[PDB]
Design a protein around this ligand. Sequence first.
Ligand SMILES: Nc1nc2c(ncn2[C@@H]2O[C@H](COP(=O)(O)OP(=O)(O)OP(=O)(O)O)[C@@H](O)[C@H]2O)c(=O)[nH]1
Ligand SMILES: Nc1nc2c(ncn2[C@@H]2O[C@H](COP(=O)(O)OP(=O)(O)OP(=O)(O)O)[C@@H](O)[C@H]2O)c(=O)[nH]1
Lengths: 170, 453, 441
Amino acid sequence: EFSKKYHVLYQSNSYRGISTNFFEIINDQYSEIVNHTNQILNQKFHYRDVVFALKNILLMGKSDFMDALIEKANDILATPSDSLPNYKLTRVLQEAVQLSSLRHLMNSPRNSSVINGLDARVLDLGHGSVGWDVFTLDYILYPPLSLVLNVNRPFGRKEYLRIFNFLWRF
Amino acid sequence: MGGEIITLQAGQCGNHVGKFLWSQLAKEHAIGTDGLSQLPDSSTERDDDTKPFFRENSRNKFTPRAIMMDSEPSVIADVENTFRGFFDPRNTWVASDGASAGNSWANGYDIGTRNQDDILNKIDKEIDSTDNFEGFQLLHSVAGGTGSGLGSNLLEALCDRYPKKILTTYSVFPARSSEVVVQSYNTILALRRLIEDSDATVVFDNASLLNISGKVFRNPNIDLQHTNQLISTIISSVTNSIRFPSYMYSSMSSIYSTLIPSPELHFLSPSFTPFTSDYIHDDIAHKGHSSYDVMLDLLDPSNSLVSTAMNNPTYFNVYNTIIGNVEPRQISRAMTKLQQRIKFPSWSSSAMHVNIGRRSPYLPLQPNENEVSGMMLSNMSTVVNVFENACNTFDKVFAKGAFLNNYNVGDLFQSMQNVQDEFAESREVVQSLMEDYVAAEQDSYLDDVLVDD
Amino acid sequence: GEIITLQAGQCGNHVGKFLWSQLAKEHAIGTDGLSQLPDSSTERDDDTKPFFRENSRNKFTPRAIMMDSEPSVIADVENTFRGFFDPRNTWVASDGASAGNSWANGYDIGTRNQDDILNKIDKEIDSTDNFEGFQLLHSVAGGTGSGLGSNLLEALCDRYPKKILTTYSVFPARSSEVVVQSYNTILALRRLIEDSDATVVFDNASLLNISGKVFRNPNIDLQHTNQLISTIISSVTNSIRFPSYMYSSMSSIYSTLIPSPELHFLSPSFTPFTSAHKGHSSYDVMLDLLDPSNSLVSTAMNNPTYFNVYNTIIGNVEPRQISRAMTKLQQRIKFPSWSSSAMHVNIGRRSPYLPLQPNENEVSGMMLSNMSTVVNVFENACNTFDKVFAKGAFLNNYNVGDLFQSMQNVQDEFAESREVVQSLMEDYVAAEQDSYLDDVL
Ligand SMILES: Nc1nc2c(ncn2[C@@H]2O[C@H](COP(=O)(O)OP(=O)(O)OP(=O)(O)O)[C@@H](O)[C@H]2O)c(=O)[nH]1
Ligand SMILES: Nc1nc2c(ncn2[C@@H]2O[C@H](COP(=O)(O)OP(=O)(O)OP(=O)(O)O)[C@@H](O)[C@H]2O)c(=O)[nH]1
């Protein structure tokens, strides 16, 4: 619809070419498409909600949720989890998500998908080390949120990774 | 480290405080007096967490995780009639034992020991109905003998029933006791078990309560309901750190870590700014205060809920929680101003702690004058004076042995000599507590480990 | 598969009337017996054949026979359910009203008029082809009822040795008539030890207490007790009356519940129910069933030795809550070191043709157990009988027929009953121990 509208607009404005009418039509098109992209990313994908969820999970913004995860996986962090099938780890993660205040988001349909977007992958760091040290959080993005938000990309600087490691030590 | 907390209402004053606290939480979380949440169950997104305090049976009903235990069924029936369906009728204990036969601590202890099976079964059922548990919150109400005895029996059962749970107690002390001897006996017999088993204890002196209720309210006459309203608001403010979890303090154990330096020192002193959720709260938008003024009022003796009697008070652990739109620059300014005005011990360099909470999105928004409130909890040895009043009464009356014909019945000791020995042991233990407090007030308390390694 | 109800005594008549009214309200049959369902849809998921014979008029006659020496209660039931029962399935012995609450007169009447009952049951069996067994509903306290029950049990075991028989016996409460009713109770117990295949026990005192607790009026009526009996019978027979995938007969239920014919006495429980909101989930229902405050029998035991338990949950349940309740039950209930810790859960569907019971959407649950509470009840009854017998010789004054011709044979039969119930309780307290299966271990 946008393409057809601005196509008939430029067809009516073809007799002028490069002019103030062309410039103002370009400006209006840019403003409208930017507002539409913002509205779509905020409503259909909840850009700000995903940003808040990332700040609460990776940056440990939700102290209650972090403490719930810690008390749920305390035995896992205690025992060496370097050699485990990780299915029990995923089950413990799901149980902690259910028990924490994020149960509201889990019940919510869209926020359920937002939570499921988190990948339950653990990168083994150390040979026979403690479970706390061998535990690692790996997040994978998906469009159209990948083109906006930044995560621990394999070719990046691991900003979120080092911040999460620092907060994890603390 | 966050677990659910079960409320224990005991005695008439304790039941009133619990009812007021549950009404305040219902008003905050939009639950009402009907038990059914006023908010629709479709908007599940809640910034707060009613699970540690409200058991969710149905999608719209939230039963509070509380148990009431009293000897007078009249107050229980009145509370149940006022809160239709809000409370659980199975969590109400009366034992059909009739009215209390006096205001003696032994009567309450006996009525607790006899029906210990029912209350223990109810506690076991309440624990089985949940998964994550952290500890109980007991309302002692030491002013009443039967209530103090019931609380002491509950503590003496819970200490050896669940040693892995942290126990907090709230002891309400009256301003002027009617029967000074009996009330001092009951308070000392309660503080004995408080020192023995209770992990944390918060005192509430009624003198400052009456002062605040006469100052901030317009009516000169003070009523017990709006007096306990202050204590319930205090309890809701101190449980806010778990209800609406902040970013620094989100667990009762985490809160008590920075407040209890040693199991011997487990007595705190509260303070609160002019309230805003009470009955007469319209005279708050004319003070025109900021975060610094809120901190000054919190540190002022006129806003404390206990008799200060500040004569160079030695502070051990001072903590504050500010709810509202707080400014970090104003927080730092208040900290800089208080570090040059609060007496600090030379043996410990630990300073005061500041925490910032969140306001409820459904509470009535206040103007920019009192939109931000604060609560303060300080470890001061000024409570040893409130205890010294009672110990001096004990020392001046125990030389004769008055009112001994009331504490002899009910308890496990029917002779006078056994009761005298028990009261002497209670006096000795409170004297040792006061001595430990006055020793920790000095620098030699830390030097005890420096001079001997 | 077809089961014939046997209503013995006025208690049997009352519980049969209540059960048939409940089944009619469930399967949309009503009092007139005609199918209350439209004739446009014949697809049904229930099973009314083993309980209701459908005639050409599409009327469902209950497959029940009433044997009682008191025609008054039978006439009252017929008046209340005119057009429901068959007059040919009525048996009043043609001897007038009842007389004497002893087992002797009941057994004598049964042995005298056994020919009519035999012809009636033969006609009822020949009316169909697929048969599994009978269903008896009587009280062990009533003398005539216990006598008729023993007579019909003897007839069934010496006529049809292939049909499994289940009965429901309601023990009396702590009252005065236990000085004489205990005789009938222990005689019925001996007959059950001898020939019965399955028995469900009930305690009158516990039933009265539970009814007074669940009801607002403390004046609990015998009609209310019979209604509770009808509700528990419907809950235990729902699995047979609505078979979908797993349970389609009482044979599998008794196979998974009764381990051996020497242990064929079951204690029921059911909670919650009315006789209007939902507050108990499946876990709450299971913990209430475990709690003694919901059982239909007096537990009188701190920790009974559970041998075999089986529960049927009615309502929409979640497997997560099911597993949580199962784990909690396995952690709480202790099982012997020789028997397995078997716990069976059957999800029973609700009847769409049944009016909505109060407290809608509230999941409920029934549980049949074999524990050491039935043995405590039996021990109390046998102790009372031994006391009254060894202290007062008054039972030799109310006898009929052969029991009246000589009182020595009566005392010998009662001593044999005491001996067999003593061997029963000894076998039970031995199975309670782990050394019961030591002969093969
Ligand atoms: N301030 C205040 N004190 C109360 C309240 N209710 C009870 N009290 C205290 O209770 C004392 C009077 O005795 P009761 O209220 O009968 O307490 P009790 O003797 O232990 O009897 P029970 O509470 O029924 O166990 C007073 O001295 C008060 O200190 C209240 O609502 N507010
Ligand atoms: N729960 C319950 N029990 C009943 C009812 N009617 C009779 N009973 C039983 O009957 C016993 C009393 O004896 P009777 O009523 O004379 O029964 P009976 O001795 O067989 O005599 P008849 O019933 O006339 O044949 C009680 O112990 C009950 O167990 C009833 O309506 N409800």
